[PDB]
PDB file of C-alpha atoms in Angstrom:
ATOM      1  CA  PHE B   1     116.486  88.436  85.074  1.00  0.00           C
ATOM      2  CA  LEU B   2     113.361  85.693  87.125  1.00  0.00           C
ATOM      3  CA  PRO B   3     115.467  83.034  86.604  1.00  0.00           C
ATOM      4  CA  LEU B   4     118.222  83.836  89.480  1.00  0.00           C
ATOM      5  CA  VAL B   5     115.662  85.604  91.805  1.00  0.00           C
ATOM      6  CA  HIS B   6     113.725  81.927  91.691  1.00  0.00           C
ATOM      7  CA  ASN B   7     117.370  80.117  91.785  1.00  0.00           C
ATOM      8  CA  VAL B   8     117.293  81.610  95.034  1.00  0.00           C
ATOM      9  CA  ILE B   9     114.254  81.824  96.329  1.00  0.00           C
ATOM     10  CA  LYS B  10     113.736  78.258  95.749  1.00  0.00           C
ATOM     11  CA  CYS B  11     117.611  77.293  97.412  1.00  0.00           C
ATOM     12  CA  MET B  12     116.404  79.393 100.661  1.00  0.00           C
ATOM     13  CA  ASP B  13     113.046  77.202  99.871  1.00  0.00           C
ATOM     14  CA  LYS B  14     114.854  73.890 100.003  1.00  0.00           C
ATOM     15  CA  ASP B  15     118.362  74.184 102.588  1.00  0.00           C
ATOM     16  CA  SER B  16     116.874  72.447 105.925  1.00  0.00           C
ATOM     17  CA  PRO B  17     113.746  70.048 102.668  1.00  0.00           C
ATOM     18  CA  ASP B  18     116.221  69.858 100.148  1.00  0.00           C
ATOM     19  CA  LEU B  19     114.196  66.409  98.204  1.00  0.00           C
ATOM     20  CA  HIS B  20     113.780  68.148  95.426  1.00  0.00           C
ATOM     21  CA  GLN B  21     117.446  69.731  94.471  1.00  0.00           C
ATOM     22  CA  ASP B  22     117.243  71.961  91.167  1.00  0.00           C
ATOM     23  CA  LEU B  23     120.348  73.828  91.842  1.00  0.00           C
ATOM     24  CA  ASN B  24     122.002  72.870  88.761  1.00  0.00           C
ATOM     25  CA  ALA B  25     119.388  72.474  86.455  1.00  0.00           C
ATOM     26  CA  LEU B  26     118.723  76.017  86.663  1.00  0.00           C
ATOM     27  CA  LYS B  27     122.962  77.389  87.153  1.00  0.00           C
ATOM     28  CA  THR B  28     122.040  74.982  83.433  1.00  0.00           C
ATOM     29  CA  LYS B  29     119.707  76.739  82.290  1.00  0.00           C
ATOM     30  CA  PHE B  30     121.486  80.183  83.780  1.00  0.00           C
ATOM     31  CA  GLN B  31     123.910  80.007  82.059  1.00  0.00           C
ATOM     32  CA  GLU B  32     122.656  78.342  78.857  1.00  0.00           C
ATOM     33  CA  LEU B  33     120.031  82.143  78.379  1.00  0.00           C
ATOM     34  CA  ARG B  34     124.201  84.482  79.116  1.00  0.00           C
ATOM     35  CA  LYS B  35     125.083  82.440  75.883  1.00  0.00           C
ATOM     36  CA  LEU B  36     122.178  82.560  73.952  1.00  0.00           C
ATOM     37  CA  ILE B  37     121.277  85.963  74.942  1.00  0.00           C
ATOM     38  CA  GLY B  38     124.226  87.819  74.191  1.00  0.00           C
ATOM     39  CA  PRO B  47     125.818 101.434  77.105  1.00  0.00           C
ATOM     40  CA  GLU B  48     124.433 103.671  74.756  1.00  0.00           C
ATOM     41  CA  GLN B  49     125.505 103.542  71.723  1.00  0.00           C
ATOM     42  CA  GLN B  50     122.665 101.659  70.811  1.00  0.00           C
ATOM     43  CA  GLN B  51     120.941 104.558  71.192  1.00  0.00           C
ATOM     44  CA  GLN B  52     123.015 106.753  69.679  1.00  0.00           C
ATOM     45  CA  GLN B  53     123.545 105.119  66.933  1.00  0.00           C
ATOM     46  CA  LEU B  54     119.646 104.381  66.609  1.00  0.00           C
ATOM     47  CA  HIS B  55     119.238 108.655  67.133  1.00  0.00           C
ATOM     48  CA  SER B  56     122.036 109.510  64.281  1.00  0.00           C
ATOM     49  CA  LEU B  57     120.308 106.445  61.917  1.00  0.00           C
ATOM     50  CA  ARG B  58     117.311 108.811  62.393  1.00  0.00           C
ATOM     51  CA  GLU B  59     118.350 112.406  62.082  1.00  0.00           C
ATOM     52  CA  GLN B  60     120.274 110.540  59.142  1.00  0.00           C
ATOM     53  CA  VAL B  61     116.434 109.523  57.485  1.00  0.00           C
ATOM     54  CA  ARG B  62     114.903 112.756  58.639  1.00  0.00           C
ATOM     55  CA  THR B  63     117.597 114.134  56.775  1.00  0.00           C
ATOM     56  CA  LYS B  64     116.979 112.529  53.497  1.00  0.00           C
ATOM     57  CA  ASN B  65     113.163 112.694  53.454  1.00  0.00           C
ATOM     58  CA  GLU B  66     113.869 116.593  53.934  1.00  0.00           C
ATOM     59  CA  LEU B  67     116.695 116.265  50.333  1.00  0.00           C
ATOM     60  CA  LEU B  68     114.137 113.955  48.784  1.00  0.00           C
ATOM     61  CA  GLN B  69     111.199 116.071  49.589  1.00  0.00           C
ATOM     62  CA  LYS B  70     113.231 119.300  48.448  1.00  0.00           C
ATOM     63  CA  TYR B  71     112.214 118.026  44.789  1.00  0.00           C
ATOM     64  CA  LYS B  72     108.410 117.782  44.698  1.00  0.00           C
ATOM     65  CA  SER B  73     108.064 121.729  43.222  1.00  0.00           C
ATOM     66  CA  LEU B  74     108.899 121.442  39.840  1.00  0.00           C
ATOM     67  CA  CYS B  75     108.007 122.033  36.211  1.00  0.00           C
ATOM     68  CA  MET B  76     110.618 122.009  33.399  1.00  0.00           C
TER      69      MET B  76
ATOM     70  CA  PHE W 106     132.866 132.259 -25.585  1.00  0.00           C
ATOM     71  CA  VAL W 107     131.558 135.688 -24.851  1.00  0.00           C
ATOM     72  CA  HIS W 108     128.633 134.350 -24.592  1.00  0.00           C
ATOM     73  CA  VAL W 109     129.061 131.694 -22.030  1.00  0.00           C
ATOM     74  CA  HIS W 110     131.389 133.556 -19.664  1.00  0.00           C
ATOM     75  CA  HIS W 111     128.077 136.837 -19.756  1.00  0.00           C
ATOM     76  CA  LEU W 112     125.882 133.523 -18.929  1.00  0.00           C
ATOM     77  CA  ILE W 113     128.738 132.335 -16.417  1.00  0.00           C
ATOM     78  CA  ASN W 114     128.272 135.808 -14.639  1.00  0.00           C
ATOM     79  CA  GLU W 115     124.512 135.891 -15.138  1.00  0.00           C
ATOM     80  CA  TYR W 116     124.019 132.482 -13.741  1.00  0.00           C
ATOM     81  CA  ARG W 117     127.178 133.337 -10.358  1.00  0.00           C
ATOM     82  CA  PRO W 118     125.432 135.977  -8.320  1.00  0.00           C
ATOM     83  CA  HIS W 119     121.616 134.276  -8.373  1.00  0.00           C
ATOM     84  CA  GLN W 120     122.661 131.174  -7.756  1.00  0.00           C
ATOM     85  CA  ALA W 121     124.694 132.624  -4.871  1.00  0.00           C
ATOM     86  CA  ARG W 122     122.174 133.851  -3.575  1.00  0.00           C
ATOM     87  CA  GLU W 123     119.079 131.074  -4.066  1.00  0.00           C
ATOM     88  CA  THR W 124     122.300 129.174  -2.012  1.00  0.00           C
ATOM     89  CA  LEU W 125     121.998 131.744   0.805  1.00  0.00           C
ATOM     90  CA  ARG W 126     118.467 131.906   1.548  1.00  0.00           C
ATOM     91  CA  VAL W 127     118.687 127.415   1.485  1.00  0.00           C
ATOM     92  CA  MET W 128     121.213 127.992   3.806  1.00  0.00           C
ATOM     93  CA  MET W 129     119.663 130.348   6.422  1.00  0.00           C
ATOM     94  CA  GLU W 130     116.182 128.275   5.919  1.00  0.00           C
ATOM     95  CA  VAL W 131     117.559 125.834   6.691  1.00  0.00           C
ATOM     96  CA  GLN W 132     119.470 126.966   9.473  1.00  0.00           C
ATOM     97  CA  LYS W 133     116.189 128.209  10.520  1.00  0.00           C
ATOM     98  CA  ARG W 134     114.512 124.949  10.437  1.00  0.00           C
ATOM     99  CA  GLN W 135     117.169 122.790  12.453  1.00  0.00           C
ATOM    100  CA  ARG W 136     117.262 125.413  14.972  1.00  0.00           C
ATOM    101  CA  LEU W 137     113.683 125.515  15.080  1.00  0.00           C
ATOM    102  CA  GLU W 138     113.769 121.370  15.926  1.00  0.00           C
ATOM    103  CA  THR W 139     116.850 122.173  18.023  1.00  0.00           C
ATOM    104  CA  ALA W 140     114.238 124.018  20.641  1.00  0.00           C
ATOM    105  CA  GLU W 141     111.725 122.039  20.366  1.00  0.00           C
ATOM    106  CA  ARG W 142     113.394 119.398  21.134  1.00  0.00           C
ATOM    107  CA  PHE W 143     114.947 120.244  24.161  1.00  0.00           C
ATOM    108  CA  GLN W 144     111.379 121.625  25.404  1.00  0.00           C
ATOM    109  CA  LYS W 145     109.927 117.870  24.866  1.00  0.00           C
ATOM    110  CA  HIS W 146     112.799 116.720  26.412  1.00  0.00           C
ATOM    111  CA  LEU W 147     112.552 118.915  29.662  1.00  0.00           C
ATOM    112  CA  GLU W 148     109.173 118.173  29.810  1.00  0.00           C
ATOM    113  CA  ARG W 149     109.495 114.438  30.127  1.00  0.00           C
ATOM    114  CA  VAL W 150     112.978 115.545  32.550  1.00  0.00           C
ATOM    115  CA  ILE W 151     110.022 117.048  34.809  1.00  0.00           C
ATOM    116  CA  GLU W 152     107.377 114.113  34.217  1.00  0.00           C
ATOM    117  CA  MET W 153     110.191 112.032  35.155  1.00  0.00           C
ATOM    118  CA  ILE W 154     111.091 113.828  38.083  1.00  0.00           C
ATOM    119  CA  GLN W 155     107.267 114.342  39.659  1.00  0.00           C
ATOM    120  CA  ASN W 156     106.622 111.034  38.782  1.00  0.00           C
ATOM    121  CA  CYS W 157     108.839 110.237  42.206  1.00  0.00           C
TER     122      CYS W 157
END
């Protein structure tokens, strides 16, 4: 999250020299990014899907040899 | 009447034998046709299977 670090750096550099106060802009941008962005459950689901796809491919290839 | 009875008795067995032979031939032909149709169907099934 480079935005929070950049906001903290700007607030620390502009503590005494408050020429351009972008604290509100940074907070609004952070809130908007958090609203727009939206555990290992996804990884487990992906592993299960990969295993199921491998099983389906194996089952499809099991019916390759067929004479009559 | 005697001649008619004799002719009927003479024509019954030959006609029965001819009908039995024709029925056997028809059964053989139907069985062969069914076997050929089943073979062609199995060939088409194998073709459709190997298609995918």
